[PDB]
Amino acid sequence: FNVAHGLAWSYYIGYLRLILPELQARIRTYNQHGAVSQRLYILLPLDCGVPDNLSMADPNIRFLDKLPQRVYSNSIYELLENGQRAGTCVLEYATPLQTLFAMSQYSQAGFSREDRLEQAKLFCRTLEDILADAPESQNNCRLIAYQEPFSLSQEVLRHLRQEEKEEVTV
Amino acid sequence: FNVAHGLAWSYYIGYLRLILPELQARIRTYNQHYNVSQRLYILLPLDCGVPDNLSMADPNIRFLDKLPQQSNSIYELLENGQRAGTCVLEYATPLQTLFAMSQYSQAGFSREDRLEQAKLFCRTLEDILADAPESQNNCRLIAYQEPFSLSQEVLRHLRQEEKEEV
């Protein structure tokens, strides 16, 4: 009874597959007006704790604007270092992770905190395999899996600079 | 391996648990007028084929109104052009996720796998609602395998519910 399989497939079939194909084009139009990354960075906190505002999780992550255009709203966030803009990217949480959290607060589910973490890892692996064989192929999508004990802004910044490195070497 | 498990739990955790608790109150406030049923009837077509308009599936199923808040819609059921029943009718949306996977070659999801997961989705959702407080027996599942009148199949369940109520 692996609930992550359904959550991952539904997350790709019902959401990721419908916003990723034209994601770059929306970013390119924005970048015509600083610069924004080309990929959608999805945060996968293995504790399955998704706050309503990303600014709370890390003070160095601050809202900048929403990416201009079923229709779904993605928003561009800027990451800070000593109060200075070190990176800006489209950041969003893995929404199915809250479904794992709500199940663990549902006594009739039998979902323990250990089961939630275990399913969170399965959700991350399955989405990886899905996107790997996917037309978007993570070419517009990066997966951020992190287990809080940690600067979240530093972890996304590390991947952003690596993406820029790849963009100029390859 | 079984993708229906996630779809069922997500459908209950992310949707059913948030509309079912107050469903009767919204229907009761609506039912103040025209002094209909108290349950949410979910259609589970085992073909995983969800039309955009329910009127197409059966011409005897017609839209009447949307349940006002305190989005679900109230449908009217016909028999020989006469209204024989009125209820809040809706599809099990995760069934389209099963259909889209069957049209995704990279998934490895065959038409036989779609039916198997559709049946598993129905059984799993049944057990979930059985042990659920929010269910309150205000939600009934209509599972039907197309070969049958869908309007008649729902009608059979509405009259049974009224029978039990008295």
């Binding site: 019902g14 709203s73 479904t99 | 949306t93």
Partner: peptide
């Protein structure tokens, strides 16, 4: 509907 994820 099933706009479970952000919209």
């Amino acid at each position: 509907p099933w706009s479970y994820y952000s919209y």
